[PDB]
Amino acid sequence: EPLESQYQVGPLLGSGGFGSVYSGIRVSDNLPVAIKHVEKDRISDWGELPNGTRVPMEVVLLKKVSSGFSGVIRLLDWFERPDSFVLILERPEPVQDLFDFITERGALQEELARSFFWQVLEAVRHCHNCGVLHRDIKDENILIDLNRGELKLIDFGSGALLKDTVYTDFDGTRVYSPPEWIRYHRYHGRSAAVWSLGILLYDMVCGDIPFEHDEEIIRGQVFFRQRVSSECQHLIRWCLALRPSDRPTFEEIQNHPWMQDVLLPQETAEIHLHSLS
Numbered sequence: 001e002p003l004e005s006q007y008q009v010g011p012l013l014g015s016g017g018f019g020s021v022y023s024g025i026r027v028s029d030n031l032p033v034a035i036k037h038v039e040k041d042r043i044s045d046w047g048e049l050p051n052g053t054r055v056p057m058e059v060v061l062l063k064k065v066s067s068g069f070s071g072v073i074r075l076l077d078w079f080e081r082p083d084s085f086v087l088i089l090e091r092p093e094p095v096q097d098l099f100d101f102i103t104e105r106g107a108l109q110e111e112l113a114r115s116f117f118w119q120v121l122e123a124v125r126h127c128h129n130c131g132v133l134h135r136d137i138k139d140e141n142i143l144i145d146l147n148r149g150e151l152k153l154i155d156f157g158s159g160a161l162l163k164d165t166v167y168t169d170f171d172g173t174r175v176y177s178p179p180e181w182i183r184y185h186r187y188h189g190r191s192a193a194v195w196s197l198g199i200l201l202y203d204m205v206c207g208d209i210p211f212e213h214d215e216e217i218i219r220g221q222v223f224f225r226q227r228v229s230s231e232c233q234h235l236i237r238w239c240l241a242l243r244p245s246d247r248p249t250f251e252e253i254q255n256h257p258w259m260q261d262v263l264l265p266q267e268t269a270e271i272h273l274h275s276l277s
């Protein structure tokens, strides 16, 4: 029942101002897991479990999205310690984050970018349907299950319950934040999400993000540094519309001409991932 008897703890995987994550194995079935520790003192957002339990908002959100759909890394279990919470998360093997993947490969071929972006969209839709807003969509928060060619969202440490009214707080990544936040400190969940997806898509096909400074975000002029098709440029520019109401809905994105004929995840892996080149 204690954490230490159910799981064998291994070396560090990663960390940050969000938490520290270790490799692990569930003793009962040898299932590979990831073990994330969060300091109670570093937690700003608290939530309530349906049985009235004070936990980190991150746990609340994870639980809501953690039914079997495989586009998010699921929370298998959690533990409370005197000064921390411990999250047991699934761990695909082999696995690589999208940030490292792009860095390794440079800009992605559009067929691959299409597959990846489509899966991210499906994963984000899943989250919204579960009443959860991620608020930090970016390459570092996306894992690739290399064998299956399936992408998985991680790190709901900056997330919130999804609502239809204005958010006046943001603790996600600034260069992925929309102009309305930069200018007015106000945004709506879905349209800000679409903005971040526009940045993500650009990063996929160009190998780097489009904006570095606040003035660039506010200007909203997108320059392409890599060869990118006219349909992909159009979708990107659309997602990066300065006015939130001018941005496409998720329906409109997925009905966009650039998005048609997406590969299945296993196809994607066979063509693009199972290779030395």
Ligand SMILES: N#Cc1ccc(Cc2cc(O)n3ncc(C(=O)Nc4ccc(F)cc4)c3n2)cc1
Binding pocket: 013, 014, 015, 016, 018, 019, 020, 021, 034, 036, 073, 089, 090, 091, 092, 095, 096, 097, 140, 143, 154, 155, 156, 157
């Ligand atoms: N690659 C990589 C990879 C990606 C991120 C990290 C650090 C990190 C930081 C963080 O604040 N959070 N918050 C949640 C996760 C998480 O779920 N990470 C994770 C899960 C399964 C897995 F197989 C690998 C990482 C997480 N990871 C480590 C390894």
